[PDB]
Amino acid sequence: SYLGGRDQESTGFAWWSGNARLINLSGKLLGAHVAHAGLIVFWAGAMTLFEVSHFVPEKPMYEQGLILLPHLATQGWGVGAGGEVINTFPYFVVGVLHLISSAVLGLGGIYHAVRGPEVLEEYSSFFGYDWKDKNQMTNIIGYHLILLGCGALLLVFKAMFLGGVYDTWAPGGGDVRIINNPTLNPLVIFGYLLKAPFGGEGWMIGVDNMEDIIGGHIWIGLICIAGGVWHILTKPFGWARRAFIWSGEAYLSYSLGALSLMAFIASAFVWFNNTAYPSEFYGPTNAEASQAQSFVFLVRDQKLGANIGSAQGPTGLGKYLMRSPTGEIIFGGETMRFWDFKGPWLEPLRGPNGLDLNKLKNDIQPWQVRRAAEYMTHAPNGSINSVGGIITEAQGFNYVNPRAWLAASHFILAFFFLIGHLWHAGRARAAVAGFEKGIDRETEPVLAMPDLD
Amino acid sequence: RGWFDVLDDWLKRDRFVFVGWSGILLFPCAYLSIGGWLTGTTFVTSWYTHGLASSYLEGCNFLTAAVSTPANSLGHSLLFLWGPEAQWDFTRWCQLGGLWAFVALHGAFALIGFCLRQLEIARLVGIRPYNAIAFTGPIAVFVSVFLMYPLGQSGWFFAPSFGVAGIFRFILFFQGFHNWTLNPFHMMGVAGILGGALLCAIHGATVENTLFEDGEGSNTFRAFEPTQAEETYSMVTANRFWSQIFGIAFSNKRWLHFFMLFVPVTGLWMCSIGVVGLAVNLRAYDFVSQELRAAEDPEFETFYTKNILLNEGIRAWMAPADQPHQNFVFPEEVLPRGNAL
Amino acid sequence: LNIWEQFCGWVTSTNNRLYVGWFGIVMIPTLLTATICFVLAFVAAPPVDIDGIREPVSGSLLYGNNIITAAVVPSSNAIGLHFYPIWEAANIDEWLYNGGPYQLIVFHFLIGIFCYMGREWELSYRLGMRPWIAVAYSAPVAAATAVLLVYSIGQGSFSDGLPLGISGTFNFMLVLQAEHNVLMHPFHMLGVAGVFGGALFSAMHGSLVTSSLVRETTEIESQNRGYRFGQEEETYNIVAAHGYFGRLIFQYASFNNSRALHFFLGAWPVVGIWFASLAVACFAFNLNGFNFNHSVLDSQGKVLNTWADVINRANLGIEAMHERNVHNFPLDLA
């Protein structure tokens, strides 16, 4: 009787809201995502295939303004020692293996959207899925979570078996080292989650000593697997059946929350962390460069013959080495805010209390300052187009510091996804309550309620 | 008919753009000063007025392109193309000013022609105008910033320059040389515009939150024959919504719309009478208090005396470069520098 | 009936003067602590040292300053991004000298401004309305995210980032132009056109109803009176208002149906300001509006003055004068 198709007047949806003809169509929704996952994979190779051939290996990696090649060099596809790049051929083959893998992911999203069946469900009793047969909808999350945790164990078999992951805490700058003991002990790694989200402590962001990262994806792989075979074998519970809406959009409005939740935290891994994202490949953070500005002017005035300590500043406070509120001797000036800085350089200046003046004189080597002199000129400070440094400085060098140039571009997207989560939760709660199209003419629910005053 | 009624039967026809018997002042004077402005961004320039390169021909990419001003040593003379200064020459005219004179004047003369226009269609459909009453917001901004601000001060170089960044200079002019923030006549205007921006946002929400859904479809934009006497939003559920959440609620559907007229129009009118105080620079940058123990007392430490030294950061830094009329040149240790920066 | 359903069934009930329901359970305590602390910090808070050296800057009405000049005067540079509650202070005099009551009216206020955004949803489910007003309130709750929390995270300390007060709001803007250049930035310039359009579209649609209103009274009384609240007949004819604003501009320039018009009043200011609030969220990570300084130049190579360097000669002067003690080093990249 029906079988109208895709018009304005069979489904009640217009040319905009241009998917909601595929809420109930099971088969063509699969052709939506496979054409979309073919499109994410298409960008994932062709950006790196554009990043290589706009690459120069002699110039440092953050200089040319590229954001995927520092993701590859954290896993260590051919980085020698100290952040020099020895081989660019593993960077080339990883994108062509994404460029060719988009075409076979592109055939699915055009077969399942055009030629393939419209009634995905009605088939061999496998896919079908009535956003309301709960036992079936948990099996979809169970099929993904045994594959999500198996991609979680693909990092540790990269780190513990094939070569090794890059490590900025290596002696001699930074180097790939094959990690031989990740941490299993949950009182420090699940103890990351029970920490303060503020400065100092740093809840999920300050995650130094790289063998706790590889301890993460052992512990995130062995929970997503054990969560994956939970949702195959059982059903949702009794309280979950009456607490969680249970329909199409909303059953898809929960991914806009924990997501917008994900790229809030990913807009802080790329902004504060110095061990999951190395500064030799991404560039320095805001905390690193402001310590580095104070550090190169210290060792200049140390080499210019001037007792560091005894120097009061312009203000009464110490110009170089004052003390933080809790006793660790830190760098002076405006760098009291980044007193929690724990980069790889100046960790050989950390004493028991902090920046210790037995070793702050007579243990600055010429490698240490020329790294911090590099991060001082390469601070996260840019224009829209290219121009780095402060804005009252003229345009000379062009550099956007792709820590900062990536942190905002997820925060545009992490804010926007909290909107449409909240916007889809409105149409969610009005899906099962039947007033998605507005109030009734005759049975108005306000008139049953009494007067306020 | 007569001689004049045949003309009045012409301009009040149902042509697709309505030409208007008041439109003969508009349509010359509004194609000029749009298209007078659009040559001043591209072709004619500054650098003979106050030493700036502000055209597409010199190559600035529209976020610093503007038809500027006349010079400061030139007074308040309406550079007239055929005027004393003009000497009937296109060049130099624009190079020494013009435009901005031309565009400013013609724009001012139109805005009359548009507010005459919406009065004129309001009688033809018989509609009781308030758009012309609500255009007194926009016309009192233009004649009191681009017209009556420079005529209190020196000549039209200190008038704002027509561009996006030429306005942005005139912004940071009014921060430093006048403190146009924190005088109270500007601060009602921020209550006017931001209060106006809520009342169209919050009224745009609730008509899309209380609907009848007469149609059997899904799209909410359908089922609304314009010739429909029954009202499409509730106002009984919307009053019940806002009496609970905010505690106060519009308990009748008129004066919900009169308040949306009133809240940005009286915002601009209070903002319009502030810059006429700035025209004779009755600035109210200074407080009569809070300064004598900024002089006697270094222990008295407040945001306002922090803010008043920031305006000294304007007035001795950009003023040699903003106004090369006086040739102000500064020897680099007379400028207020705070520290190492 | 049940003891807990007598609660869960009082709090979610509609017949109350304000809705206390489940988002209000976080809101009503944790916003009203920020109300009580705001009136007391405005009046008698001891000065707090914004600059992070020593200098206790006063913003309370007992210490000689006006209501324009008063502030909550935000927390110190020395604490940084530390959680500094009232109990990790050794004394409350140590709290209030070193940035105490600012963070009490930030973390309480930002919780209380988000649960309002949930509470505006919650009654629209508890009535028959279609719930799309939490997304409309997601625009000035984002402005509360940016300059209170989000910009103060990425810049460093909790020192920078107040609006708290009146002159301290104007001091915060003039440094955000000075430090990292609000003005020539395409999210803020898109954002003010939403507000300026939202200035006009308030005064446009609000005029055009008050224009095209039907006759139901006489001249001597008010014309706001003759109908009753809750009537079903539309007080102004929409066909007359459409062919007047149509007659003004052209015929297809005006919305033939009013239900599409009210989406556009709830689009143009609300899409605008969360671009402007994603200017400051983009400005948190020092991704600033672009510099056209020294752009045009002679074939000699001599510099040519633009408006942009004239903005910069104003912008460098606020940068060379702000925070007049704390800079010991030639760049302000902290």
Binding site: - | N239, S243 | R17, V43, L61, I67, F229, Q231
Partner: peptide, 30 residues
């Protein structure tokens, strides 16, 4: 003197913020 002049007009504005919430007239439908 001036310090009580601000606190007077502040809390007299805040008193109407209490009175308009509680003692709003009831709207009646007809």
């Amino acid at each position: 003197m001036e310090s009580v002049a601000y606190i007077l007009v502040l809390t007299l504005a805040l008193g109407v913020l209490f009175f308009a919430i509680a003692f709003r007239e009831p709207p009646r439908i007809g």
